[PDB]
Amino acid sequence: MGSSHHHHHHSSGLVPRGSHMTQVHVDGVTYTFSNPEEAKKFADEMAKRKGGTWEIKDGHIHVE
């Protein structure tokens, strides 16, 4: 008794202009996610299939 599905959509509304946007650097292409959650999600998944790693330093991520 009592089985409810929690639900949400990831939305910032605007990009915080007074905040460092977490850039993902892979294959020459530079993605930029203000929320580091999305940046890590992309970086991990991309580095996973390649067999490499990544790091966060001053919002700068590099997918090996």
Residue 13 resides in a domain: no
Residue 7 resides in a domain: no
Amino acid of residue 12: S
Tally of domains within the chain: 1
Q: What is the number of other CB atoms lying within 10 angstroms of the CB of residue 47? A: 17
The token duo for 17 is 């202009």
Residue 1 resides in a domain: no
CA angle (12 as vertex; 39, 50 as ends), nearest 5: 15
Q: Both ends of the chain: CA-CA distance in Å?
A: 48
Any idea which residue has 């580095």 for tokens?
Answer: 47
Structural domain including 46 reads: 22-62
Where b means 16+ CB within 10 Å and e means fewer, 7-46 reads eeeeeeeeeeeeeeebebebeeeebebbbeebbbebbeeb
Q: What is the number of other CB atoms lying within 10 angstroms of the CB of residue 63? A: 22
Amino acid of residue 30: T
Please indicate the experimental technique that yielded this structure: NMR
Residues belonging to the chain: 64
SS3 1: coil
